[PDB]
Amino acid sequence: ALVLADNGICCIDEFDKMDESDRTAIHEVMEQQTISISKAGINTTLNARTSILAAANPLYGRYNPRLSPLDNINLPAALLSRFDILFLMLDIPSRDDDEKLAEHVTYVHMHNKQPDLDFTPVEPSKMREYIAYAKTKRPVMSEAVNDYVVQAYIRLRQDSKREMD
Amino acid sequence: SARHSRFGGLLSIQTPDKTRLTVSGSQALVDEKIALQKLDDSK
Amino acid sequence: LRIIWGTNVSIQECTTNFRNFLMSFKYKFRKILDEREEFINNTTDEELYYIKQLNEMRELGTSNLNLDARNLLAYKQTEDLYHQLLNYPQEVISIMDQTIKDCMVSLIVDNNLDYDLDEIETKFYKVRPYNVGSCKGMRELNPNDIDKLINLKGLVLRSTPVIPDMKVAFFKCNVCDHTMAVEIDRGVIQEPARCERIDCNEPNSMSLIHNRCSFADKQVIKLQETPDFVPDGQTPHSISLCVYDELVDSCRAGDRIEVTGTFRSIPIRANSRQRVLKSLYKTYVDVVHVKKVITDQDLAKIREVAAREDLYSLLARSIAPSIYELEDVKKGILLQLFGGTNKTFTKGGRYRGDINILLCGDPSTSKSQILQYVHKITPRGVYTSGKGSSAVGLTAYITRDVDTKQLVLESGALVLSDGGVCCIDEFDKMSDSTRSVLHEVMEQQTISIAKAGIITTLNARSSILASANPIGSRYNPNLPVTENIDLPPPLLSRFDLVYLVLDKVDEKNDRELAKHLTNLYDDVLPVEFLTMYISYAKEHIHPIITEAAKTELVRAYVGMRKMGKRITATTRQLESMIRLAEAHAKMKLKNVVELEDVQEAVRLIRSAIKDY
DNA sequence: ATCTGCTTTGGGTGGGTGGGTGGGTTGAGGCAATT
DNA sequence: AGCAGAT
Ligand SMILES: Nc1ncnc2c1ncn2[C@@H]1O[C@H](COP(=O)(O)OP(=O)(O)OP(=O)(O)O)[C@@H](O)[C@H]1O
Ligand SMILES: [Mg+2]
Ligand SMILES: [Zn+2]
Numbered sequence: 001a002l003v004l005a006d007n008g009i010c011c012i013d014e015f016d017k018m019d020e021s022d023r024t025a026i027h028e029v030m031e032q033q034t035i036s037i038s039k040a041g042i043n044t045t046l047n048a049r050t051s052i053l054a055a056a057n058p059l060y061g062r063y064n065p066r067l068s069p070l071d072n073i074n075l076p077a078a079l080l081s082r083f084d085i086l087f088l089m090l091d092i093p094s095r096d097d098d099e100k101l102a103e104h105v106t107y108v109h110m111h112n113k114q115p116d117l118d119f120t121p122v123e124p125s126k127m128r129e130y131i132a133y134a135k136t137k138r139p140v141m142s143e144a145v146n147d148y149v150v151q152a153y154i155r156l157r158q159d160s161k162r163e164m165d
Numbered sequence: 166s167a168r169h170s171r172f173g174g175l176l177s178i179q180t181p182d183k184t185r186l187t188v189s190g191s192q193a194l195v196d197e198k199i200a201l202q203k204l205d206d207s208k
Numbered sequence: 209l210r211i212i213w214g215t216n217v218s219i220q221e222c223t224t225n226f227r228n229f230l231m232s233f234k235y236k237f238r239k240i241l242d243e244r245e246e247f248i249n250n251t252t253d254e255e256l257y258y259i260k261q262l263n264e265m266r267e268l269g270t271s272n273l274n275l276d277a278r279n280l281l282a283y284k285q286t287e288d289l290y291h292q293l294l295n296y297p298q299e300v301i302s303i304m305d306q307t308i309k310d311c312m313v314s315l316i317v318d319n320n321l322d323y324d325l326d327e328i329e330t331k332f333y334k335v336r337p338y339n340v341g342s343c344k345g346m347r348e349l350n351p352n353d354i355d356k357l358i359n360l361k362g363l364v365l366r367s368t369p370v371i372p373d374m375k376v377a378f379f380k381c382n383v384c385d386h387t388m389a390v391e392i393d394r395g396v397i398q399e400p401a402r403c404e405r406i407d408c409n410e411p412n413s414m415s416l417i418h419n420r421c422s423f424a425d426k427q428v429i430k431l432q433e434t435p436d437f438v439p440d441g442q443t444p445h446s447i448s449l450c451v452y453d454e455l456v457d458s459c460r461a462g463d464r465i466e467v468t469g470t471f472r473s474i475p476i477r478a479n480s481r482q483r484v485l486k487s488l489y490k491t492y493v494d495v496v497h498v499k500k501v502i503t504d505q506d507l508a509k510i511r512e513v514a515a516r517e518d519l520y521s522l523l524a525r526s527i528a529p530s531i532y533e534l535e536d537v538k539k540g541i542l543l544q545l546f547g548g549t550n551k552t553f554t555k556g557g558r559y560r561g562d563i564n565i566l567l568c569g570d571p572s573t574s575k576s577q578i579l580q581y582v583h584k585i586t587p588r589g590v591y592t593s594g595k596g597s598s599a600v601g602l603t604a605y606i607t608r609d610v611d612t613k614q615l616v617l618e619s620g621a622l623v624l625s626d627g628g629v630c631c632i633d634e635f636d637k638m639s640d641s642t643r644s645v646l647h648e649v650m651e652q653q654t655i656s657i658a659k660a661g662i663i664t665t666l667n668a669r670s671s672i673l674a675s676a677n678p679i680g681s682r683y684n685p686n687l688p689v690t691e692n693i694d695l696p697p698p699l700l701s702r703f704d705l706v707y708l709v710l711d712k713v714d715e716k717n718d719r720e721l722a723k724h725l726t727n728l729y730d731d732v733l734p735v736e737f738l739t740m741y742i743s744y745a746k747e748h749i750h751p752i753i754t755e756a757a758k759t760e761l762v763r764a765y766v767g768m769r770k771m772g773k774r775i776t777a778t779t780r781q782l783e784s785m786i787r788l789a790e791a792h793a794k795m796k797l798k799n800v801v802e803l804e805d806v807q808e809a810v811r812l813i814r815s816a817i818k819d820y
Numbered sequence: 821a822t823c824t825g826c827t828t829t830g831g832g833t834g835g836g837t838g839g840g841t842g843g844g845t846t847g848a849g850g851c852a853a854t855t
Numbered sequence: 856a857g858c859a860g861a862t
Binding site: 190 | 209210211212213214217223298299301302303305306333334355373374392393394395398424426452455472494575634
Binding site: 481482483484 | 856857858
């Protein structure tokens, strides 16, 4: 499945359950962006510059506020660090939000269509072609933006050290 | 023949009358005495 | 009159055309053909090309002549010859071979040279055309291309052992002991019905002496297409090749090669008993050409760089340019690459000249980068990660050949690094058995395996450059190195240098690192020069210790012991210091170890003992 | 030149004194070593 | 049914 995702985004569900062999495989992919096979029957090496999109559940099956995120996540800390963006989505009960979600799901079940009417969703084809066009492009950066990002980096490092305390 | 046995070069020799005989072998492709020798030997 | 079957082109005209092409042809014709006439010189382009190529071949004693197709299109005479080659490759190649031999003999005959003619008459001569048109795709090979010259670019995947292909059969009589050799045509033996001797005309008394026949080399290769030829990403297809004579073993598995051959097709028998053939024909390629895609001056350049006053920092910087502000680590790695002198001892055991370095610290810093760089530089070595199925394996292991269904002893990464650097990226996560074999290697420098009926020992004289990470999310200075590293004291005591690269949060340091990284979006040396220099020094130079070096070594060791009851240094540090001094002497290409070498070695070892 | 006679594919309507380096390859269950 | 052998 990873081969099919070469030069593309990979959709991995139930990431936490995965076996150590596949974990090592993805660890190799991220660091080296290469697929290597070493077998007597065949010896073929394929490059893999593919992105990974993972979904996982906490260690205990739900997030525990008492325990910090790191302990909640079973995966190695290095693997979490290698991720470009790590999103943590939680299910907090709430009267208003719960009512909205229930109304949405139930309308979908009764009518078989989107409930929202404030805005009209853009056609999928237009979005896909625009995404491809964006992938085709190539931006550039100057020195002033470099200085700005450098300053942001030192600020973030100081804040993160203070938090890690 | 320098090449291997299965290289597969085919010949067409022209008799004094307008008929063409078929011989196989690079040596035949080059020479005519060898072609006639092979013709005799293949009988 | 000789005419190729199914065509209306004479063989005699072809022979004379190619002979005229060979005896008279110049590169200037090719240059004007490709619209590069303005680049024509006055000496090389105006001199006969293939005559020179024949003369040099005769001087060297070789036979194969590499021919480029376009040169046929460059000469007015040979356009039809080029097209015929592309359409009837077999016969055209045959006439080309004979014309080459004929012109070779004619050169000596006309030039009345002293070179022996009998030797020339004995040689089989060949031509190897290449670049015969835009390379096609393995998926675009239709039946229209059967018996036609094609070009394929693909990745080798396997190659069978040499196959003995029969050329001339040998027969012997059972009542007269008379032998005569009969040639073969398309794999059929024209065995006689009776002896050719008039006196003994006995019939059906012929036997085939298998070991007195004549055989030629054949080999079957498997090819797979390049990644860029795959339209969507499906499984690449595979085509089979056949190579004869000097092209045998011309390419190893995993190579990218461009192959020129004749797309042939052969029937397959339904069974090994009758003559019935399947209607489906199997294809393959009959290859005729394959391409793969130190000097006094080098020695003089090496001496010139060696004489440079600032050689040390130069090599250190050149090892890994993209890394920032890790001078000590780079210097240690540079010493490791050269390696200390290796000692062959009588009345005493062998003393290893390798250097083992452990690059351990926080995950933020650059450590796999340095291992990758070292792998690139090293003349011999491997890259591996502990508990990594992708890697070949650190220990020799007995397996079964799937292709041949045979048992084969396969050497692991450590054995394949003999004389080189084996970089192990993930030293922390390792099987206990792997950590036992590593101990045996770093101690005895050999791996012993005694399983599956085999008792053998394999040399593993390889250095090690491993990397380690902390147990938690960061390195805690309060705790000792051993607790954080999660390695046995017996194991981390064996590394000659241990480097603690920590990402302590400092405004200045983070500022500089960020500036360097963003800018990435004092001369330096090319990697090829560095590896050649390292190989030259490692193969030729063997520094020796002296009385002054002997005094300084003893004094430094005693000083490093007296610092402590706590044992500051052990006799291991003495061996580390002597090895490091020897390596530093090697880097200067010096045959002797001076006070400066020992002093540099102590500075690195003492600093290494320092933060570690 | 004519008449007489055996054996396939591959498979259990040949077998286990022919074996598994002559191919028929997943599924279950027991055992040592690894845990 | 194709090929291997005896009259
Ligand atoms: N001079 C440098 N100093 C510190 N970090 C660097 C430097 N140059 C590059 N880096 C960072 O290090 C990364 C490469 O190192 P790498 O990710 O292999 O770290 P590691 O400590 O070897 O291992 P891990 O994979 O556990 O992080 C680069 O992507 C960059 O983020
Ligand atoms: Mg790393
Ligand atoms: Zn005889």
